[PDB]
Design a protein around this ligand. Structure first.
Ligand code: NI
Ligand SMILES: [Zn+2]
Ligand SMILES: [Zn+2]
Length: 494
């Protein structure tokens, strides 16, 4: 059927109307750029000389050549010094330049990929940078208010099957990210647990994954007390969304990914302040992460098994909502005292984690926008991590190093498990205080993890951003979707 892709590798500059060219801080031109300079009677040299065009990293200069040439626009993007130039410099160079092209409302673009390759960054890599960074930079918030770029040609003298391969993975990663951004940016009345369950089903159909969606009654029968406690105040029914992707002949070494899917967090009876409750549609950020990553896995079909489990519900006030001091029986059969109804996320994750384990997960990663504390500990741009297994954590850390999404581990100590076990009435205390706030939530989850190698990721700070950047709009960031995807590529068992 020969379907056209947005990103296309060619050896020819068929579409020279709109160009994108990287410039190093060499002090001579070469390759295409030199030919262009000559083709332009030395104008590009003059512009560099006068500083109208700059090779300083992330400077973007737009030149409009004479119509005589076949070119209307050139977007020059500075790359700094070639000795310092790395892959993630490439990502940022593409992001900066497509920010500008997205503003300019251009439809077709020819990138001279080779102007971006170097010792450190080969063609296939530059290609990955381009599609991923392009997709992230040009993303638009799906709004409900009362132009699109649809062709990017990567023009290169290198193996087209390889370059195209880079463009394809780049594009998969960006697509899953943007998917997650979408789910996250959606107003809570537009995305209930029910809507989240349709999305998952559509995804399951599209990529032929096994999908099961447990409803309240099956949850009652199975004893899912965590997820049912949070849902008690809701009229919107709950969902436990399960997705199976078996990409190995044997259902074994299964990677369990658990996402917090709280579709709106009011904080419940332990009520949240007037400023704190705005933006709490984004409390399903963790679910976005895993769904985003399923999309990526569905596109790249790696040789790995993955169980995705997403407990999903809103957290509301009513005549029947959970109350502070309630004691509950989790799925695992552990009892939990609810000291704080705003610590609802770890209740649902606890059931999610025990379910994943019950369904053959042999390693776990949970992703949750879980605590304000993580923001205090690490800021808005560094996701917090906790683990019960250094070896598995190394795999997750390395994934994040490849992803480019920064992670930092916080300790779980014996003293920490002491605090979480400190409840007068139950096995576990859902909220011991602000002291090591993020670690308390990690520590609680790890009790449900028991012996299964596990990593918890708190994306309360990294799941959203106040301001636009080169890599996308204000609002949801789709953080972690990449890192989970990469983890499933790179994961090898014990
Ligand atoms: Ni063409
Ligand atoms: Zn909460
Ligand atoms: Zn929450």
């Amino acid at each position: 059927s020969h379907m056209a892709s947005m990103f296309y590798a060619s050896d020819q500059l068929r579409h020279p109307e709109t160009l994108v060219i990287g410039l190093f801080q060499k002090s001579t031109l070469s390759g295409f750029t030199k030919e262009l300079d000559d083709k332009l009677d030395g104008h590009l040299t003059q512009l560099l000389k006068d500083g109208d065009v700059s090779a300083k990293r992330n400077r973007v200069s737009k030149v409009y050549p004479p119509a005589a040439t076949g070119m209307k626009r050139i977007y020059f993007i500075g790359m700094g010094r070639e000795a310092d130039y790395s892959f993630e410099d490439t990502k940022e160079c593409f992001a900066r330049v497509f920010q500008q092209i997205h503003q300019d409302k251009k439809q077709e673009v020819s990138v001279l990929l080779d102007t971006f390759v170097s010792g450190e960054v080969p063609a296939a890599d530059a290609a990955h940078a381009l599609s991923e960074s392009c997709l992230l930079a040009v993303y638009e918030v799906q709004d409900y208010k009362h132009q699109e770029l649809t062709s990017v040609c990567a023009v290169t003298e290198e193996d087209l099957r390889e370059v195209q391969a880079g463009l394809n993975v780049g594009a998969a990663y960006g697509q899953g990210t943007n998917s997650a951004r979408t789910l996250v940016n959606m107003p809570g009345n537009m995305l209930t647990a029910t809507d989240l369950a349709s999305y998952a089903a559509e995804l399951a159909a599209k990529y032929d994954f096994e999908c099961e969606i447990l409803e309240k009654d099956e949850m009652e029968e199975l004893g899912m007390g965590g997820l049912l406690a949070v849902n008690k105040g809701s009229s919107e029914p709950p969902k436990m969304i399960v997705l199976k992707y078996q990409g190995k002949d044997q259902w074994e070494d299964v990677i369990g990914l658990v996402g917090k899917g709280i579709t709106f967090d009011t904080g419940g009876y332990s009520i949240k302040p007037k400023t704190g409750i705005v933006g709490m549609k984004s409390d399903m950020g963790g679910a976005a992460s895993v769904l985003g990553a399923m999309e990526i896995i569905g596109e790249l079909r790696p040789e790995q098994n993955v169980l995705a489990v997403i407990p999903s519900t809103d957290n509301m006030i009513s005549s029947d909502a959970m109350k502070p001091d309630d004691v509950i029986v989790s799925l695992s059969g552990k009892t939990i005292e609810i000291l704080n109804t705003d610590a609802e996320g770890r209740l649902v994750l606890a059931d999610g984690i025990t379910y994943a384990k019950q369904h053959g997960a042999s390693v776990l990663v949970d992703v949750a926008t879980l605590t304000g504390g993580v923001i205090v500990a690490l800021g808005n741009e560094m996701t917090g991590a906790m683990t019960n297994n250094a070896a598995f954590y190394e795999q997750v850390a390395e994934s994040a190093k490849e992803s480019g999404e920064p992670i930092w581990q916080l300790p779980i100590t014996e003293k920490d498990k002491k605090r979480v076990r400190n409840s007068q009435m139950a096995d576990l205390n859902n909220s011991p205080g602000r002291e090591g706030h993020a670690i308390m939530a990690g520590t609680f989850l790890g009790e449900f993890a028991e012996n299964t190698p596990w990593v918890h990721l708190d994306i309360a700070g990294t799941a959203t951003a106040n301001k636009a950047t080169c890599f996308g709009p204000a609002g949801a960031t789709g953080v972690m979707a990449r890192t989970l995807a990469v983890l499933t590529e790179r994961f090898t068992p014990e």
